[PDB]
Amino acid sequence: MTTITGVVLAGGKARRMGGVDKGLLELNGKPLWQHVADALMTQLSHVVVNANRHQEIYQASGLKVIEDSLADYPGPLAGMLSVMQQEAGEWFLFCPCDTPYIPPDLAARLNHQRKDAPVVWVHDGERDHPTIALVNRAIEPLLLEYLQAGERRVMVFMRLAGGHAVDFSDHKDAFVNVDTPEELARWQ
Ligand SMILES: [Li+]
């Protein structure tokens, strides 16, 4: 019964027994992933999180936690696909767990600027953020096909799928990434 599902991408792999769980690093006392989930819930009713480590911690805030298929596909697209395979509904707005300042018109502006494309993503004036992306259902089989072929490249997929960047360069700093604990310490 809603148009777009919000999805926090809180990562996969655990390639050495994890290391740092980025989504759980705390900014002003609140996990980065929750900053992102709260920003999505401002604009969307149904928000879920894709997480593959420490799932019980993610589950504590009461959102649905979606794990990756045992297929173990590489990179951010694997989590997008896992979520589409486990959630109904025609549209998904993905956002990595490390961009805590995303704005309340994210979904609105991406939707306004879609212009018939099945995927659009954010361009912040300086770079693409291809995993901050509004993605139609119809992308699911193409993603499955891409991943089964052993591919991983996100931008390449986004181009193959026929998407385009949407210009959010006027939103100063809403798309800053908090990539490491060292970076995080600067935003407290
Ligand atoms: Li651990």
Curated annotation (Swiss-Prot):
Cofactor detail note: Both divalent cations appear to be equally efficient in an vitro reconstitution assay.
GO cellular component, as recorded: cytoplasm
One GO-annotated biological process of the protein: bis(molybdopterin guanine dinucleotide)molybdenum biosynthetic process
Effect listed in the UniProt record for changing residue 19 to L: Nearly no effect on catalytic activity
Residues the entry annotates as binding GTP: 9-11, 22, 50, 68, 98
Cofactor names: Mg(2+); Mn(2+)
Pfam family membership, one: NTP_transf_3
Family listed: Belongs to the MobA family.
Known partners and oligomeric status: Monomer. An equilibrium exists between a monomeric and oligomeric form of the enzyme, which could be an octamer; whether this oligomeric arrangement is of functional relevance is unclear. Interacts with MoeA and MobB in vivo.
Alphabetical list of NCBIfam families matching this protein: molyb_mobA (TIGR02665)
Protein name as annotated: Molybdenum cofactor guanylyltransferase
Organism taxonomic ancestry: Bacteria, Pseudomonadati, Pseudomonadota, Gammaproteobacteria, Enterobacterales
